[PDB]
Amino acid sequence: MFTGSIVAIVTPMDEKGNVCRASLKKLIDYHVASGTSAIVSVGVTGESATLNHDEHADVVMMTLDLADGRIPVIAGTGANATAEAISLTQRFNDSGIVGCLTVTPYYNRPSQEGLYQHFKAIAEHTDLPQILYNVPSRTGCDLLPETVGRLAKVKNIIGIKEATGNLTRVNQIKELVSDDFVLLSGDDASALDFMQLGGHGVISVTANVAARDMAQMCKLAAEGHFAEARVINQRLMPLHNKLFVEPNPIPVKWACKELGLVATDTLRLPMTPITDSGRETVRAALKHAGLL
């Protein structure tokens, strides 16, 4: 549902840069077998930026069909114009996705009030559960805990993917929201810490290639066995870091290809092919995780 290890899944592509169904099916079977709790379809790791809204919807629906009721699917629905966010959200109403992951508007730098009105209008135009998403280093905008508290009073807004890497936010948000409001890390390197402070899981890039370890780590964390969870985190830490050695998802798509999970590591510009030095860096991190 909205708990444990949730993969921010890549959108695997053929050499032409279009979705490759056989590779997507291989990934979804892998996440079912691995114990991944849910899939976020067409977030930033899934190249939401370079897919148009039609292509993006086609991938979400294909992901849903291929999941075949075995694993819940959350759609990325973020947009920097409120009307476009509503419109994109409506494509998925009565579709079968369990919720939406919707980012703070990027580039136009709204105020906290602008953020409130933006997410509130979106929530009012759907019955789908809404997971807020804050990532200031991408967006230029920072959804502060106080505004998260405000928005959590909307029945429809049920959690946050917090990707600042600033762990003080866990308890700042938690004291302001109800006990069933869900706190998800959006930063793999600090995600176990995030959970140790009272977070309920992680929307993860690492999970794309280390799904079993990630699911086991988040289960141990939820059961309070933090020391046993750290043994896994330490195994996974070079990956947590090196999967951003070049802009995400360039590294994780290369790693997927190296593990035979996808046929090609093709991306859409302005993402470019991984460098040679990047390959060797990601290879060593996979080696340290015990996957190669």
Add this chain to the structure above:
Amino acid sequence: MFTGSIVAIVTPMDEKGNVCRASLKKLIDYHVASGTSAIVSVGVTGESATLNHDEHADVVMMTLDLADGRIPVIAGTGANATAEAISLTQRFNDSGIVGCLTVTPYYNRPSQEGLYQHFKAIAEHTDLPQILYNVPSRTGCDLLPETVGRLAKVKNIIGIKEATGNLTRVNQIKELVSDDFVLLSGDDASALDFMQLGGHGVISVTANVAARDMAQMCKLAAEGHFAEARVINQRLMPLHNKLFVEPNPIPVKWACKELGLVATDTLRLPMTPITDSGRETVRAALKHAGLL
């Protein structure tokens, strides 16, 4: 024209958020009479983020029509997907615009090599002059001088709107590019400094309401009379700062309304109306400038 005071013009709207032709005409007439060098149509101050490409194109064509050859027009054509930037550029090919202002991809955070490939591809598939546009605080990425140097070798990449507010970039870029490559500030508060270091002009928000002063200040700067340009800049400095007291273009659309230059100050979400405190702060800035 790509020197002097260039206005990043607002897209004036009626109460429903649709472009208001009569207000736009008045603004354009104002810029013709006030000596503004050119108009940037549908950049961030023109709410590029919340217009769809159809409306974006309509506003540019309307600006061209209303300008009626009296003032050059540069279209904002930025996008975070390379194919989308190319497509948008194609809509304006034989439109009458003199050039394009194209931002670094926002949100997806490409590498320097990705930026190179992004802008090279856009440049290839048009004859129109291209002005690069760097604004890290909005985009999450930073086009460094080295990469600006590589891109300046492309014949129709002719300049940069540099909006870091980091003044060391003027001469780091200048030494790496040829003498006819144009360096334009995108940060009103540091713009006079920017020109004094070697910059050729400014793509300005302040120019929306202080067009005559901005034009004279930029001319004095180009003539080397920096002391007499600073006197004007000192009067304009509260405006340079307080036009961003709330997210741009909220303050400047309000200012345009207060001066009678536009019928309403309506914006599209996620921009929201100016607060009372911002009303007061902007009004005092306009009075310091001698505009009220």
Add this chain to the structure above:
Amino acid sequence: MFTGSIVAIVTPMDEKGNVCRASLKKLIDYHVASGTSAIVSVGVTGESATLNHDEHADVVMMTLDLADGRIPVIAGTGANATAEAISLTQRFNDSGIVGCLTVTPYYNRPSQEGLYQHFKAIAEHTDLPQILYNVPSRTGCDLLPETVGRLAKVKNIIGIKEATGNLTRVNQIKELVSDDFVLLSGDDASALDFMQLGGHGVISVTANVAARDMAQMCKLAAEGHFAEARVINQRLMPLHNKLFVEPNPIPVKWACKELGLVATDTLRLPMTPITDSGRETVRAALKHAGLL
């Protein structure tokens, strides 16, 4: 010892700016009665910067005598020259203090290697236990976890006061050091979080005026009762923040005076008297904590 709520005690002064013994004794009796685990004497909150080494030693020794074996006393021994740090440390050898709190050199910005050699030489010139102290916003220098791991192999170096406010450091340091190496927060607002991640206590400014609450919070935290600890933290949070509304220790000395714990709130330049607006801000925070 090196655990629980450790107060970074103010150096109370008469109006002439010299240590006031009656006020210091009142504070030490208060910390004994309150359950404070230890006193840090003449750290930054105790105005180490504006006391010369003689005056600073006189205060440490006076604090020790007045403590009278009832509560352990750690001496501040930091200096930005290694030879001065050794010399200051040696004044306290065979004195009765239980350990030293020694800051990364400020102003001269040493390398990580410089930090290693600096603290290693200090440790080799004493039998006293050494607590490393990292506060980049004051010093201009950041002791990274890797170097902390290196230094922890010195028998004599036994813990760190980590005052970054960056909680990722707790587990980065912990995986690199032995299980008896002590992790202390140096940032009151994030200190409970710090403890929840595996920290062993806090060297606290808040403890100066809320010693009982602080001791109870750290005991609850050490016993894993984090939710009961947060009720206290929330009570104490305006203090955690507002005790730095003006430069520390200007606010906490005013608060001490207001609570009748010290006779005067006098400080040495360049610290200046609290502003009127600062008084009312600190008063409200004391009120919220239930102390006024």
Add this chain to the structure above:
Amino acid sequence: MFTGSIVAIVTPMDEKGNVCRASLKKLIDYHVASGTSAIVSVGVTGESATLNHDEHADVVMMTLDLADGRIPVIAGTGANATAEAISLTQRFNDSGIVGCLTVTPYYNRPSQEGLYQHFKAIAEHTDLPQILYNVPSRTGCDLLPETVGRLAKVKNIIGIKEATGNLTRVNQIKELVSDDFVLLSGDDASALDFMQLGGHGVISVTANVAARDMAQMCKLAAEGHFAEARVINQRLMPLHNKLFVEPNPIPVKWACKELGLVATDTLRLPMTPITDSGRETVRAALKHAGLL
């Protein structure tokens, strides 16, 4: 003299870390012959941090004696306790120095009002000209233009060494102070830009090894011939950056040794010897400058 190229001179040392008179003499003779405007004795590049006040004073008196009236000498007199700065200043009253360079208190992080009171008190109790010195990355605090404006009204506060590398400060300060208040860069890499914006000179680390070039570059800058000054600056730019590849003055003392200007490159802890990689990087920078 308080314009032009002013060298923040190294304090050359023998293998035991004591001032080496013969190396110092050679440096001073070099600066007299090379057209350096003045010598800052015992600033941070002169290891003020690791000399005690006795040695600090000795080095200044030795510099004065060796200079023998041929070059003006400014003593570093900065301290983080106001009474200590006053005392240090008193040691130099009728010494022959032309002025003092006094840093914002480091570590204790005073307010703007504290900085005002700090520097006003120092100024009151001497007749010597005072140059304020702002370097936030070392000190943890930032003397803002507003406060520089208040302090410039004090008759013997005559200028500022501005080492933010933030070039907007040149004209923010200039408009708030009188025309004979001197604005000096403390950041070699942005110094030419600083002078082009209105600055009068630089207190420079690079000048230790490229004194002739620095003197000519600063003169060309003062004459308004910025293009011909930039050619020199372009040759010096790798030195401007790589003299801080490791903490200053480690690289520059090594460079001085490599050129034969000083007998050894010894420093005092917590500064440590240059690494092999830094040896290589600085040597290539010296060759780019045409010095080897």
